[PDB]
Structure formats: C-alpha cells, structure tokens
From a paper:
The main anchor point for the CAK complex on core TFIIH is the Arch domain of XPD15. Here, we present the high-resolution crystal structure of the Arch domain of human XPD in complex with the central domain of MAT1 providing an atomic resolution model of this important regulatory interaction.
The final model was refined to R-factors of 0.192/0.227 (Rwork/Rfree) containing two Arch/MAT1 heterodimers in the asymmetric unit. Within MAT1 residues 66–129 are visible, the last 12 residues seem to be disordered. For the Arch domain residues 246–439 can be observed in both monomers with residues 294–316 and 291–316 being disordered in monomer A and B, respectively. Notably, the two molecules in the asymmetric unit show a domain swap between the Arch domain monomers where the two central β-strands of the Arch domain base, which is composed of an antiparallel 4 β-strand motif, are exchanged. MAT1 contains three α-helices which form a helical-bundle: two (α1 and α2) helices interact with the Arch domain and the third (α3) packs above them and thereby stabilizes the fold. The Arch domain comprises a total of six α-helices and engages with MAT1 via α3 and the loop structure between α4 and α5. The interface is thus characterized by a significant charge complementarity between the negatively charged MAT1 and the positively charged Arch domain.
Residue numbers in the entry:
A (entry chain D): 66 to 130
B (entry chain A): 246 to 294, 316 to 439
Write the structure that this text describes.
Amino acid sequence: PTVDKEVEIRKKVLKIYNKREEDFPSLREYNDFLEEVEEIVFNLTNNVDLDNTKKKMEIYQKENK
Amino acid sequence: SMSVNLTRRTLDRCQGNLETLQKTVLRIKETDEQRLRDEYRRLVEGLREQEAVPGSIRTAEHFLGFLRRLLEYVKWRLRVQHVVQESPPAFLSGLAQRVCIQRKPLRFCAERLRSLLHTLEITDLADFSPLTLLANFATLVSTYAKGFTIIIEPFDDRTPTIANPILHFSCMD
Ligand SMILES: [Cl-]
C-alpha cells in the first residue's frame, strides 16, 4: 500500500467512525475507539480479515445512523 | 531549543529511517512479538518517562503509519517555488484535512518515538537523528500552536480568606 491509498481508506473509515472526544463520557472510551479505528484502517489497507472487518463497519454504521 | 529546521534532504533521511524501523518491526513480529506487547502494556498501563497516550498511536505499526502520513504532508508542503509563512494552527489544519492527523497525537510524538526506539533496542541513537528532529517538530508545533497567555486570578481558591492573587503564564489561549 502507498501512503495515498492508506489516506483514502482512512478518510472513508472516518466518514463512518466520525465521533470526536466530546462524544464519549470518558477519555478511556475515546482512546479505545481511536485504537479500534486504527485496527479497521490497518485491515482494509493490508487486505486482512476483510469480511469480518466490513461486517464490523456495517454493524457500527447501523448502530450509529 | 524551541526552533527546528527541516530540509528536504533531512526529510529524505527520515524516510530512510522509517523504512528501517518498519523492517525492524516486521522482523520482530516474526521473531519476538512479546517485546511489542510489553511496550504496549507500558504505554497504556504503566511506567512512562499526566494524559494517556492517544489510542491512535499506541501500537508500533499504527505509530509508524502516523509518522509516514506526517512525513508525506511535510514533503508536500515543501514543494513551494516561493517563501511561505503561516501560523501553526493553519499548518495543523492542513495536516488534519490532508492526511487525517489531529493535534493531540502530535503532542506525544517525541515521547512515543523514544519509546519505540528503546523497544526495538536500537543501540545507536544518532542513526535516527533526522526522524527525531521530525518528531520534535511535531511536538513543538502541536504543543505551542496557540502561543502563550497570561491569566491573573484575584485570589487563590485554596485559601479564599486571604488576598493571594495568582499570575499564570502558559499555553493554549
Ligand atoms: Cl489537543
């Protein structure tokens, strides 16, 4: 993957995982959320566990419509 | 001190540094992942040398990807044909817009890099002087982005029956 590919994948993910620090009652929950976003971007970027990852994104997006 | 200069050639050496680090992390993933898990545990729940390390740069690979996006933004900015001057907040705004890097993880860049270098047990430190320079820039520009402010409080809350006003000089206003 090029950095350009990583960035476009990241922007797509963040359009869905779009929460900010003030959307979480605690900093711990926010930081866990950030790490989850990294795991999703890494999976889509490196073509790893794709089905479970896009399953996860669909569930998150339904729960956060 | 509080000044940093980054040349195009310095950034080329940073790209070399990131290449080296990425190859080292892949080797360690194939040979000794426990070292990486130990660094993670130290960062999230143990000894550091206030605020928790942001969840976007806890793992070695997430942090290396973060540094590649930072380096690529900075390389892009240096492709000018004339002098450019801008405020730190404008530079950070471009950073967030173009490569999705926010100000807060930038604050942690120097410390996270020192942790990563200690964890990969890289003995020589001058070898990574360019990347460290980039990390320092990241920390300085994020920490001091809004300059300084003076706040005068007419009395101390701890001792509200005496006139002990307080002058505060600090960042972030
Ligand atoms: Cl911040």
